[PDB]
Amino acid sequence: KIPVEADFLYAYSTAPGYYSWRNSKDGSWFIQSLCAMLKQYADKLEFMHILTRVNRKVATEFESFSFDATFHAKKQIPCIVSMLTKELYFYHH
Amino acid sequence: KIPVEADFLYAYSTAPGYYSWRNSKDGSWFIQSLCAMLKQYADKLEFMHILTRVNRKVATEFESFSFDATFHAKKQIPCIVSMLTKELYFYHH
Amino acid sequence: DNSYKMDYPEMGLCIIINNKNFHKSTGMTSRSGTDVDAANLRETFRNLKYEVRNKNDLTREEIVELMRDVSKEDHSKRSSFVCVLLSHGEEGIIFGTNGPVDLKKITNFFRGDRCRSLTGKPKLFIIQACRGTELDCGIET
Amino acid sequence: NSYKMDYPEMGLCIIINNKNFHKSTGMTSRSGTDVDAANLRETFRNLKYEVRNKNDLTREEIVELMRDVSKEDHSKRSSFVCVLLSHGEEGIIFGTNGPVDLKKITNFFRGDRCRSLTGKPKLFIIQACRGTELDCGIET
Amino acid sequence: LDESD
Amino acid sequence: LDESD
Known part of the structure; x- marks a missing residue:
């Protein structure tokens, strides 16, 4: 038996x-960074480590x-919430 | 600048x-599992990967x-909340 | 067995919900730039070999019905599930074009007991939305 | 990239161990928590943290303790660890005499308020309830 | 026995 | 320009 909330990951763009x-021309900071880090790293890094690089890039x-x-010179940190029970790779051996 | 909420990790014992x-003799399931996984893997694995094994052990x-x-045969999944911007290893090199 | 089994026939579905225009009722302003995000996600998850479905400007009822319907498909030959939400939000809340939806209501359709063909498989929810009205002023490094 | 963990000190590990509560909280004695507190003390000792164990603090003592720790000079420390072992609710931890918001405690350590931990990992390990939902699990 | 927190 | 969500 496993918990019914196990094996979810919530990748929030910002802290609670x-x-x-969101940049009105280039899109949200978080999605721009997530797509870039997946493009660069999905063929080799585990997903939490990709998401940690997404945190660093957004920050x-x-x-x-x-x-x-009022809204000028503000910062953002994304928030990884993992109920995962295993490592996640977007490739296979 | 960095966000003032960056570089926090919240390792919650259970989901929101x-x-x-908590076992009345052996202690809470989460801390039992956290200490065991640190003992076994702190010399080798990055901390999010250690916490994912804690998730698995608890689950x-x-x-x-x-x-x-009412309280019998219930389950638990811990919840890792990471605002970290880098990988964390408890050794050096 | 420290890694999820990702060699099922299919990587899985990637559902992208892209809400850009909100009912003048709601009072929310147009989310300029969100189509770039939606298109970038579609291409990123295509390259990861996900079956991507892009949906635009969904009411809160259509979001609940879509996610319910997707949760009743047979994911037996899929390794994983991904959902991306691009919208206005509040803590624990995502907005349809006409009003709020609890994120819990959406993710509950996929719980291990209620979506059995995803039991034991990673379910990823990517959420681009506000979670309140605090501002981070930063600290000089 | 990886946090620099080769400062002269790994850092503090603060363990707050609340076992006995005022009857008004309605919490029964947290049997088993002393085993957790000693297991943690040993585990972090072995990782070369300076462990400080605190037992049965009121919510005022928790805040005063965390404020004081946040005002120390962590310049020669790589990281900070705080372990809370108590009753809780979502977003809340219990002192022996009542609840305090977790944000109250963690805000002392924000990047702008604890400058000697800026850029350093700040770890909060929390053994406490987050509500009253029960997980019945699913057969596998 | 198991207790809740 | 940047906008909030």
Whole structure:
């Protein structure tokens, strides 16, 4: 028997309670970063490690630009919530 | 700049909304499993991979035993919440 | 057995729900840039050999009916399941074009007891949405 | 990339072990928690953390303890670990005399409020209920 | 026996 | 420009 909530992964774009940021031309910071890290690393890294690089890329390479001072120069950290019970690779041996 | 919420890891014993289980003699299922996996793998595996094995051990090896039918034969999955931006190894090199 | 079995005939479904325009009722503004995200995801998961389904501007009722319906398919020959939600949100809440949906209601259709052909298989939910109205001002490194 | 773990000290491991509660919480004595606290102390000792075990703290003592730890100089420490062993609710941990928000505790360690831990992994291990839902599991 | 937390 | 979700 296994728990009914086992083997889910929730890859949230932002920390609980916070806004999430989207560039009106290039798309959301998180999705841009997720697609880039999957393209670069899915043929070799386990998914939590890809998601950790997505955390690093969103955290360090992005800062909001807004004509509204209230929303200007803000930051984002994504939030990985894993109820997984095994390592996940997007390839097979 | 980095986000002020980056570089936190929350290793919760159970999924959001749920009870967490503790054996009256052996201790909580989660800490029993966490200490065992650290003892076995801290010398080798990255911490998220250690926590994924804790998830698996809790999910598969434990089920509650209670004289109250309501609380009997229940299961648990821990929940890893990572805002980490890098891999964590408890050794160096 | 420390890794999920990913050599089923199929990697699995990747459902992308892309909500860009919201009912003037809701008060939410247009999510410019979300089509770039949707198209980028479709291509990324295509290359991972997922069967991608892109859906645009779904009401909250259509989201519940889609996810219910997908949860009643036979995933026996699939290794995994992926769902991507692009929308406005609040903590634990995703918005259909006309109003909020609890994320729990959506993910419950896939619980190990209720979607038996995904039991023991990884179920991934990727969520691009706000989770409240806090602002992170950052700290200089 | 990997966190730098070769500072002179691995860091602190704070273990808060709440076993006995005020009757108003309605929590019964957490039998078994002393086994967890000693298992943790030994496990983190073996990882070269400076372990501090605390037993049966009120919610005011938890906050005052975490504030004080957050104001220490962690410059020569690689990381920070806090273990909470208690009753809880979603987003909440119990002192012996009542609940305190987990955010209250973790906010002391935010990147802007604890500058000697900025950029360093901050680990919160939480053994506590998060509500009253029961998982009946599924046969495999 | 098992107890909840 | 950046916008919030």
